[PDB]
Amino acid sequence: ESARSLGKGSAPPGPVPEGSIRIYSMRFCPFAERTRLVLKAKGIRHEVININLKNKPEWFFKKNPFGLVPVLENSQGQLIYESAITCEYLDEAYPGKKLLPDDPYEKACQKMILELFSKVPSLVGSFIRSQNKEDYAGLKEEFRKEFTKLEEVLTNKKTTFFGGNSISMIDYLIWPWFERLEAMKLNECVDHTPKLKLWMAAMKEDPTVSALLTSEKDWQGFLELYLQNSPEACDYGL
Amino acid sequence: ESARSLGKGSAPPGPVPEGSIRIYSMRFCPFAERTRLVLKAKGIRHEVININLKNKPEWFFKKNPFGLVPVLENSQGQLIYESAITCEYLDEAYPGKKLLPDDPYEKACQKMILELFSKVPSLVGSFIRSQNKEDYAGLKEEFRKEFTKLEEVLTNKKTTFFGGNSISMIDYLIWPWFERLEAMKLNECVDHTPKLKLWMAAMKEDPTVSALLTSEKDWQGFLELYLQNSPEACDYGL
Numbered sequence A, B: 001e002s003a004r005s006l007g008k009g010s011a012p013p014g015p016v017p018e019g020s021i022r023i024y025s026m027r028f029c030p031f032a033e034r035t036r037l038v039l040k041a042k043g044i045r046h047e048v049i050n051i052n053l054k055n056k057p058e059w060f061f062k063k064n065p066f067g068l069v070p071v072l073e074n075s076q077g078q079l080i081y082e083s084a085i086t087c088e089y090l091d092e093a094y095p096g097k098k099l100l101p102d103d104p105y106e107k108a109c110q111k112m113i114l115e116l117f118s119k120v121p122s123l124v125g126s127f128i129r130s131q132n133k134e135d136y137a138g139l140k141e142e143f144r145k146e147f148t149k150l151e152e153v154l155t156n157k158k159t160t161f162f163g164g165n166s167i168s169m170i171d172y173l174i175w176p177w178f179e180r181l182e183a184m185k186l187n188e189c190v191d192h193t194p195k196l197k198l199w200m201a202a203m204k205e206d207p208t209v210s211a212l213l214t215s216e217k218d219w220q221g222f223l224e225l226y227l228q229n230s231p232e233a234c235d236y237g238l
């Protein structure tokens, strides 16, 4: 019940309490998962408001002019949007495990890997446009070309994760699209990328990843409603 | 002569000397201008190699797998690519005026403005596809819609520049597309954005901006060669 989304007609929410940060999220949004993985990895006390992205509250555009999740709002009333900006803000503003390195070059390397990854989220988009076994063969080739680039980074570094032998920001920033691969029937696309495939196994063992992972049944329930343009897609399961 | 570009058949260059950083650039590339504005604003000793982007040296893909400028290479042999990553790396790695704020929220704000700007560079692309007075009217409307978003930020802050009353990273990151507006005959697109129009006048007075500004005759010379796919476009004037 508590996780039910707010949509059109919902009262603007009150001030974020001191000692807490608020995320405007949607339970199946991969971009907002980035921000929730960081909040959990850093142990930041927070509250979640889920937004019905099919049936947005008008007041939500006061939080983010683009009308997109994720959005952070703190007790001072500051608003931060764009998933990679929300994650970096949280790593700098809060104590705990640093997810980005302090060294400028190593930090730039994490960003360059994110850049290597930057076509993957629009391919997941495009997966919607796949109607038949022919489009599905092309889609799989497109994922393979992108995954080879990430495979090369792990072969150069010979580390468990993209930022070294410990999980760091860059892993959490790319993870949500890998999480969705099995439910999209694109698991085979890591078959030519053995290190990327072991990276996925190591990610699923991470306490933070494991605490936020959605079951394939849960993601399928969402997608089917999403693809009808159902106002209930966002509240699948509730 | 010294600024002449290296292209196909050119010897791989030697190691970057200690005390210097190298940029792989192209004299009329707006993305690489971002990095050169930062190098100049921060007083960083550097050397420039200009790349013939129409006739790339094969060795240039060893600097950047994407084959794009800008690229930084330091004396340790580290490579940094993507214009916004090269600029942030330089602000963190070198002394002088900080171009990004230390406060995490104010830094996130600069990034959110960059996000507001993110459609402008592909419209400049698209300006190439404009053939006639009708396409030019549509193009102008598209620039206006984007410029209104930046106009709102200056009206909210009531500062000279996008990051406060002093010029900072965010100004240098968006400047190169405004510099090119007069030569593209898109000067009129700031006519409904009076604060953005005054921001352009303040930018042209900045010592760093003014030191790197290319004349309209120089940019026209480049564009005409560029649009023929001339291998000499990059060396216009030399």
Ligand SMILES: *CC(=O)Nc1ccc(Cl)c(S(=O)(=O)N(C)CCOC)c1
Pocket (backbone or CB within 6 Å): A026, A028, A029, A030, A031, A032, A069, A070, A121, A124, A125, A126, A128, A226
């Ligand atoms: C927050 C969010 O879900 N944004 C977003 C925007 C575009 C696309 Cl394509 C996606 S998706 O790849 O997960 N897919 C279409 C399912 C929809 O997720 C809302 C997500």
Ligand SMILES: *CC(=O)Nc1ccc(Cl)c(S(=O)(=O)N(C)CCOC)c1
Pocket (backbone or CB within 6 Å): B026, B028, B029, B030, B031, B032, B069, B070, B121, B124, B125, B126, B128, B226
């Ligand atoms: C470095 C660089 O010039 N990159 C680049 C990539 C695409 C586009 Cl469209 C441009 S441009 O908007 O300046 N224009 C097409 C002129 C070409 O500049 C090389 C630049």
